Amino acid sequence: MAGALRLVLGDQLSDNLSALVDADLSRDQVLMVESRVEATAWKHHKQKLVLVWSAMRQFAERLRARGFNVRYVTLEDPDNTGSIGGELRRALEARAFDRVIRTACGKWGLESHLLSLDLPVPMETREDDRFLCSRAQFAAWAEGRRELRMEFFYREMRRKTGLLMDGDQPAGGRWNFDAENRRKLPPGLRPPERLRIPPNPTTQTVLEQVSRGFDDHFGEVEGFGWPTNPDEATAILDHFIADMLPSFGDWQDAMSWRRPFLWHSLISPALNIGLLDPLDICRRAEAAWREGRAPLNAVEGFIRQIIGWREFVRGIYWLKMPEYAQRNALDAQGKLPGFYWTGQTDMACVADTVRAAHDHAYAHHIQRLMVTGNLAMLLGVHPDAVDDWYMVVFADAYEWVEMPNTRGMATFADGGIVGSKPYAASGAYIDRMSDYCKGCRYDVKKRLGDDACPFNALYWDFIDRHAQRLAGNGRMMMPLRTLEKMPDAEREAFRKQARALRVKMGVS
Ligand SMILES: Cc1cc2nc3c(=O)[nH]c(=O)nc-3n(C[C@H](O)[C@H](O)[C@H](O)COP(=O)(O)OP(=O)(O)OC[C@H]3O[C@@H](n4cnc5c(N)ncnc54)[C@H](O)[C@@H]3O)c2cc1C
Ligand SMILES: Cc1nc2c(=O)[nH]c(=O)nc-2n(C[C@H](O)[C@H](O)[C@H](O)CO)c1C
Ligand code: SF4
């Protein structure tokens, strides 16, 4: 009866974590490690380092107030070995323990390493039931399905969770109210001001430490406004539910120059480390519709992102890894252009996305998908280099969610497991969906020449390069038909242009 050592990782900062259930406060110890292995696995955005480390330090103080004995190993500790496994060994030598208890993490490499660790005591690994769909439940649903479509999974999750269900029927008589013909913001509509969280004393200390010790990481730390504890995260969620949720379904795909937040919730960095709960978030949104404070299409569109896409991408990650991390369906071998890190590009849309990534460690979905993600696909950047960028620059970036959205939906490197079809688009899409192109130095109505918008020739070269494969796909009928009606001289023209753009941008 010596007690159990309970490991808590940087994205596991929840009281209801399975590793903390049924703890014996008089015998057990909680281990939390500020790990430089994890801090340099990718060179995370400086704001992500501030977010995680400030939140772990406050989460540890919260556990101590509840009677937990917490062994907190800071990054200034001269005896910190730097790794989770090394610090688990050091904690087991410090005193007697009967076993180690932990919760399955969200990175396959770390999870595989921990499962293979040879410790002096047994190590029990519990499932992370903070998610709404267990790993086993997704595998059971995916069994026998020749393709995994989010819509059928989303319907199952609506029945399991009972969210937006009247009896056995979905609210409103249909599952999905996704209204097509989405458009850019009207010229007079100014996006509202958003709530930011001024750093608390703990966050200020971590901020100064990150400014001084990790200066060679991407991004600015100044202006850090992310929530770092449940109260600050609830304040962000309260602000979204009351002030932005009613407009969620209107501008979900719009882009406005230097308005990086629009009406999005901005909860992913706090949700992904456990500061908010997925079921509680969705129930609050449903209650807004049930009590007449938000329309159904807005609330359903919001809940679909969380119980649908978020659970879907996690399901595919753990279902297909580790082979998923190595898939390269389009044989993309190019380098990532330097303006992804510096933002020094004449493409206004790309420059604004990198600017938001640098200044706020955030960019909303359609920019990650249709701007920087689409461009990396069209350019043929190696999927390893695209994964590294999305892991580094966004404060919500963890491999279980970053990779299926990046290697899958954004760049089709998984052959269509996640997205079922590549989301390629020319500058015409960005033009219809944003206010970028009129202020851009390029001309979105041109495909050849120095003034031509690079997305235009790169898009048609992409469809031309993968024409035979995309014909078997099926969902690319209209672009292939237009390409087939194009004379040979026009085909060779945008080909030459696309090769030149790949050289100009340092890709290949
Ligand atoms: C290339 C690419 C990379 C991405 N990388 C990440 C990542 O590292 N981490 C991450 O959390 N999300 C990632 N996403 C999903 C999505 O871009 C973000 O969840 C969202 O932009 C975060 O902003 P928000 O909280 O305001 O989202 P909202 O627009 O307010 O959406 C509400 C919530 O829905 C969830 N959600 C929405 N779309 C997705 C999605 N596609 N996958 C999973 N959850 C989703 C998030 O929890 C989000 O907080 C990525 C998407 C793409 C296309
Ligand atoms: C920056 C960072 N730092 C730490 C840390 O110091 N200690 C820790 O235990 N975890 C950290 N993490 C999170 C992990 O690297 C990893 O992404 C998640 O735990 C996956 O579940 C991250 C992302
Ligand atoms: S013209 Fe092309 S590069 Fe410029 S903002 Fe529009 S889509 Fe982006």
Automatic annotation (TrEMBL):
The keyword Flavoprotein belongs to this UniProt entry's keyword annotation: yes
Binding site for [4Fe-4S] cluster: 349, 437, 440, 453
Binding site for FAD: 252, 264-268, 272, 362, 365, 368, 396, 405
Coiled coil: none
Residues given in the record as 6,7-dimethyl-8-(1-D-ribityl)lumazine binding sites: 10-11, 33, 35, 38, 53, 106
One Pfam family this sequence matches: DPRP
The entry's keywords: 4Fe-4S, FAD, Flavoprotein, Iron, Iron-sulfur, Metal-binding, Nucleotide-binding
UniProt keyword annotation of Transferase present: no
SUPFAM superfamilies in the record: Cryptochrome/photolyase FAD-binding domain
Protein known as: Cryptochrome/photolyase family protein
